[PDB]
Paper text:
The Fabs bind to the tips of the three-bladed propeller-like protrusion of EV-[name] and face each other across the icosahedral two-fold axis. Among these states, S1 occupies the highest population distribution (43.8%), while S2 and S3 occupy 22.9% and 33.3% of the population, respectively.
Enterovirus [name] (EV-[name]) is a small non-enveloped virus belonging to the D species of the Enterovirus genus within the Picornaviridae family. The main structural features of EV-[name] capsid include star-shaped mesa at the five-fold axis, narrow depression (the canyon) around each mesa, VP1 hydrophobic pocket directly beneath the canyon floor, and prominent three-bladed propeller at the three-fold axis. Binding of cellular receptors or treatment with acid trigger a series of conformational changes in the virus, resulting in two expanded uncoating intermediates called the expanded 1 (E1) and A (altered; 135S) particle. Here, we show the discovery and structural characterization of a two-[name] cocktail for delayed treatment of EV-[name] infections.
Numbering used by the authors:
A (entry chain E): 1 to 119
B (entry chain C): 1 to 247
C (entry chain F): 1 to 108
D (entry chain D): 27 to 58, 64 to 67
E (entry chain A): 1 to 79, 88 to 129, 135 to 291
F (entry chain B): 9 to 247
The structure:
């Protein structure tokens, strides 16, 4: 029924750009907020930001301001995260989760994608 | 001592009662009062401020588009633009206004109302409108020649961008009621319709569709009585952080 | 930025032993917290939501409570699959922060 | 009416009689027949 | 111009008026001023002496009533027989929405505690003695029923029974400012750790309630309801009444219903067309 | 006519407008310095007068077909700008009023209306979540934010009732400017400049603009002038 899977994230040269694609299904896509979390091999979690699905509205963490750009498409029911200024320090596992006011956020999660750079 | 005997209503807790009670903080001096702007010492100060009616409420009007009425050039004379149902208790244009939201705490109301329409079309746009008010006791007027017969104002666009339609107080009683019956003689306020007096003439350069903005405010003779709970706010199932305050 | 301080950062216990995990909240976050269980494969699965209740389909070995500013995740009996990195989330206010984490190992 | 045996003034019963209004601050919040 | 208005204004008769340069029905809304057009100048009226009183719409009358700020049911058995409620008016939406019609408020709270006992799922309903202690912000909060924190030398406490009439006390205006802030735009702390809006920290402190007796008899349900009636009220800067339902008590966040009324896109229930009406 | 033209001279700045309507004074009050009987902080306040009292023009925003509206929060919009922004940084407390002037003009063939309203103590919400808004969401600095749902005023209230606040209209038919004079509105006599925002300037397009003439950019410019500024708690800057 409800599922979240984001493919891709294989190899990207430094200084380039990468477009994350996390697809949502099983419910009404515009009724819930979308969250983004990264995990390095260091096992610590940081919160990239959240986009309001109702429109374009976005909320970011102060550290990722200008590094990450969130956007969605109401048709495909997918959420995109544009990462620029790619460096070896940006290599980690990125997650995408659901949200919304009722019954707390982060009820569902994605598979995760490990990003690596080739220099 | 003093011989006494209890009365009915002894020990009862009445929510509206007026009595002095024991202070919990002896010898406590509150912060000295400071002058602050905008003191409201009576709620009738609030209801006299004009606020936007939502006339355009439909399934095809979404969001802010609901507060303006599209006025387009018409090819036929004597055409109705729109009408305003005057029931404040029911769900209609008057509910979300200041005069509406405050009056729904009160079961009875009295006094005159006023409507104000502002024409937001282009400067070169010109036209004449008529704003009619029909006292209750019959069906809404379908045509202008039937609607003229009541209180009306004929309005011509110009430098002054707004009118004032006074809805006078007309009743057989000192007050009216918000009871759920729409056609009740103690409830129904009458009807308000707007017809094209001549036509709306705009140049080919200007936009053809122009938007009026309706307003409503209570007058100085307005009054309210018998306060009640407001139906506007309903029950709310899941209230976040409410359980957090209980530790 | 409300900082969630998760302690202890590591622990060691055997099977069938009751353990607890506490996260600190500097600014009062109320009842808003989530306990996150991440299996070694990388899959995150939420456990407790709003500290009050448990997700549907999750075993009852897990419980949670608030005492003062302490948020305790109590496990009644450990299992072989239950040794994994646990996290505490705060959805009370933006930005959302995560606890440092806790690693579970078996006594040897 | 208005029986208060308590010493602290804030413990008195509420007084309803302030009938002063200045609706002119909300209705005519301006510095000042056609107005324009 | 400030004046003493005890009643609605009387109406004076008017005659047929046609005059050049005098247009009472014209106004300018761009000035942000309500239309000053009088019914006498708009239509032809009669002299009417209006005796209708305005006294009931006063803010002292409107906002001062007993409303339920807190309702807490705790089971009484062997255990825990007490609760600590951080005081706020955001708890119940009936009183909350009415107090939010104004930006600032200065008033004295009159608190009443109604107590009732119920049977868990008959012999008799016990008479229990309850203590309600008012703990200001920054003090030590009791962690137990029998704990030493209930001695309450300095703190203000009250003892009342179930059979006795409801316990009632008065709470003065304690804010460090000249009036309460219903809506607060900003953060309390000088660092980023602060919370947006009023937080359950500074404001009015806590209220601790327990059953003074030990645990006996076999379990009953004791529900404590707390009522607040303001008095001596001063109000400033009125505000639009809230439409969409509430979500959290710590913030103003909104969602909206699925369909009108009170939907996000549509507050008023829809109709066919602006020309549609019987 | 008499009140259609207005000139505003504060400090070295001056603004003339040939299309205006009867500039508004909020709640019938006019800005003034803190009197001695309402004072609290004992240290002698500083009064820059002509230094910090003058019009600071904010970045103009583009009025387009699907615009939802704009807000600037005060002082926050002015904290980085001019000599006003320096006194904000070095001083712990401030008390001042504000004079807001919005310029929006177009040809006589354009139609549209703007609701320019100053919302005292505007507490913003967040759509479809229980999470309180963050710091960077509320504090936009100079550029200001944008209404996600201007119909509800983003706080869950009604835009229809926004006239209860000090306001003026810019109607592209009548006037090209709106002027609002805001006194000090707070519970405390002085306030900490960075955290707390007393007023929120909200420009909303109740009626959008459209025309069949050749399209052109219509900017909306805001000029905000502090008035009767005071400052206390002189120390090093936060920077």
């Amino acid at each position: 029924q409800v599922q979240l899977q984001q493919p891709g994230a294989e190899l990207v040269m430094p200084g380039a750009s990468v477009k994350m694609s996390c697809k949502a299904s099983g419910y009404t896509f515009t009724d819930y907020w979308m969250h983004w979390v990264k995990q390095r091999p260091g096992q610590g979690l940081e919160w990239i930001g959240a986009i309001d699905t109702s429109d374009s509205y976005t909320t970011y963490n102060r550290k990722f301001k200008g590094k990450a750009t969130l956007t969605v498409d109401e048709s495909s029911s997918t959420a995109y995260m544009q990462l620029i200024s790619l460096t070896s320090e940006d290599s980690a596992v990125y997650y995408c989760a659901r949200g919304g006011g009722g019954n707390s956020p982060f009820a569902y999660w994605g598979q995760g994608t490990l990003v690596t750079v080739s220099a | 001592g003093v011989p006494t005997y209890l009365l009915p209503g002894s020990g009862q807790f009445l929510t509206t009662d007026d009595h002095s009670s024991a202070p919990a903080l002896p010898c406590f001096n509150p912060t000295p009062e400071m002058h602050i702007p905008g003191q409201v010492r009576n709620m009738l100060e609030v209801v006299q401020v004009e606020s936007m009616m939502e006339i355009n409420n439909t399934e095809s009007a979404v969001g802010m588009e609901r507060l303006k009425v599209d006025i387009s050039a018409l090819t036929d004379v004597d055409q109705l633009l729109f009408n305003i149902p005057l029931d404040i208790q029911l769900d209609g244009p008057l509910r979300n206004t200041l005069v509406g939201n405050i009056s729904r705490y009160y079961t009875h109301w009295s006094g005159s109302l006023e409507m104000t329409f502002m024409f937001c079309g282009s400067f070169m746009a010109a036209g004449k409108l008529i704003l009619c008010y029909t006292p209750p006791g019959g069906s809404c007027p379908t045509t202008r020649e039937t609607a003229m017969l009541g209180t009306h104002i004929v309005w011509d666009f110009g430098l002054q961008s707004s009118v004032t339609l006074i809805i006078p107080w007309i009743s057989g009683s000192h007050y009216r009621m918000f009871n759920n019956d729409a056609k009740s003689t103690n409830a129904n306020v009458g009807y308000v319709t707007c017809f094209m007096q001549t036509n709306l003439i705009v140049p080919s350069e200007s936009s053809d569709t122009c938007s009026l903005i309706g307003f409503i405010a209570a007058k100085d003779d307005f009054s309210l009585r018998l306060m009640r709970d407001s139906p506007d706010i309903g029950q709310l199932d899941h209230l976040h952080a409410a359980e957090a305050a209980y530790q | 930025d409300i900082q969630m301080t998760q302690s202890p950062s590591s622990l060691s216990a055997s099977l069938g032993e009751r353990v607890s995990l506490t996260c600190r909240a500097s600014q009062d976050i109320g009842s808003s917290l989530n306990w996150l269980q991440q299996e070694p494969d990388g899959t995150i699965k939420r456990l407790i939501y709003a500290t009050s209740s448990l997700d549907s389909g999750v075993p009852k070995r897990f419980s949670g409570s608030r005492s003062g500013s302490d948020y305790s995740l109590t496990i009644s009996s450990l299992e072989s699959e239950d040794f994994v990195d646990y996290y505490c989330l705060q959805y009370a206010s933006f930005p959302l922060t995560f606890g440092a984490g806790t690693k579970l190992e078996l006594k040897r | 009416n208005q029986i208060n045996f308590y010493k602290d003034s804030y413990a008195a019963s509420a007084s309803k009689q302030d009938f002063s209004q200045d609706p002119s601050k909300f209705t005519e919040p301006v510095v000042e027949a056609p107005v324009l | 111009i400030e004046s003493i208005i005890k009643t609605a204004t009387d109406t004076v008769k008017s005659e047929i008026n046609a005059e050049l340069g005098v247009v009472p029905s014209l106004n300018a809304v761009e000035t942000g001023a309500t239309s000053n057009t009088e019914p006498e100048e708009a239509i032809q009226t009669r002299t009417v002496i209006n005796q209708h009183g305005v006294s009931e719409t006063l803010v002292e009358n409107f906002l001062s009533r007993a409303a339920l700020v807190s309702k807490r049911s705790f089971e009484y058995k062997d255990h825990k027989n007490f609760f600590k409620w951080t005081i706020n008016t955001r708890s119940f939406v009936q009183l909350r929405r009415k107090l939010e019609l104004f930006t600032y408020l200065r008033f004295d709270a009159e608190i009443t505690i109604l107590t009732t006992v119920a049977v868990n799922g008959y012999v008799g309903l016990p008479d229990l003695t309850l203590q309600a202690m008012f703990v200001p912000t920054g003090a030590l909060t009791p962690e137990k029923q029998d704990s030493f924190h209930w001695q309450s030398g300095s703190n203000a406490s009250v003892f009342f029974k179930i059979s006795d009439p409801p316990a009632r006390i008065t709470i003065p205006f304690m804010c460090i400012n000249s009036a309460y802030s219903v809506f607060y735009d900003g953060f309390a702390g000088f660092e980023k750790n602060g919370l947006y809006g009023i937080n359950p920290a500074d404001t009015i402190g806590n209220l601790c309630v327990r059953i003074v007796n030990e645990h006996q008899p076999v379990g009953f349900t004791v529900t404590v309801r707390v009522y607040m009636k303001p008095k001596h009220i001063k109000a400033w800067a009125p505000r639009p009444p809230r439409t969409l339902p509430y979500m959290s008590i710590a913030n103003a966040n909104y969602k909206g219903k699925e369909r009108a009324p009170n939907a996000l896109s549509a507050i008023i229930g829809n109709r066919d067309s602006v020309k549609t009406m019987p | 006519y008499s009140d259609r033209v207005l000139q505003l001279k504060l400090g070295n700045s001056a603004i003339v407008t040939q299309e205006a309507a009867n500039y508004c004074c909020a709640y019938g009050e006019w800005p003034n310095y803190l009197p001695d009987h309402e004072a609290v902080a004992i240290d002698k306040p500083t009064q820059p007068e002509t230094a910090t009292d003058r019009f600071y023009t904010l970045k103009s925003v583009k009025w387009e077909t699907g615009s939802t509206g704009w807000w600037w929060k005060l002082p926050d919009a002015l904290n980085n700008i001019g000599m006003f922004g320096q006194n904000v940084q070095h001083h712990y407390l401030y008390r001042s009023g504000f004079l807001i002037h919005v310029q929006c003009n177009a040809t006589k063939f354009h139609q549209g209306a703007l609701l320019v309203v100053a919302i005292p103590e505007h507490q913003r919400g967040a759509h479809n979540t229980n999470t309180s808004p963050g710091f960077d969401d509320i504090m936009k600095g100079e550029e200001g934010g944008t209404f996600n749902h201007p119909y509800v005023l983003d706080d869950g209230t009604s835009l229809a009732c926004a006239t209860i606040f000090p306001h003026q209209w810019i109607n592209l038919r009548t006037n090209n400017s709106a002027t609002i004079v805001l006194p000090w509105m707070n519970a405390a006599p002085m306030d900490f400049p960075l955290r707390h925002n007393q007023w929120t300037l909200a420009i909303i397009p109740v009626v959008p603009l459209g025309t069949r003439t050749t399209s052109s950019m219509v900017p909306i410019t805001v000029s905000i002038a502090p008035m009767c500024c005071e400052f206390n708690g002189l120390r090093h800057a936060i920077t």
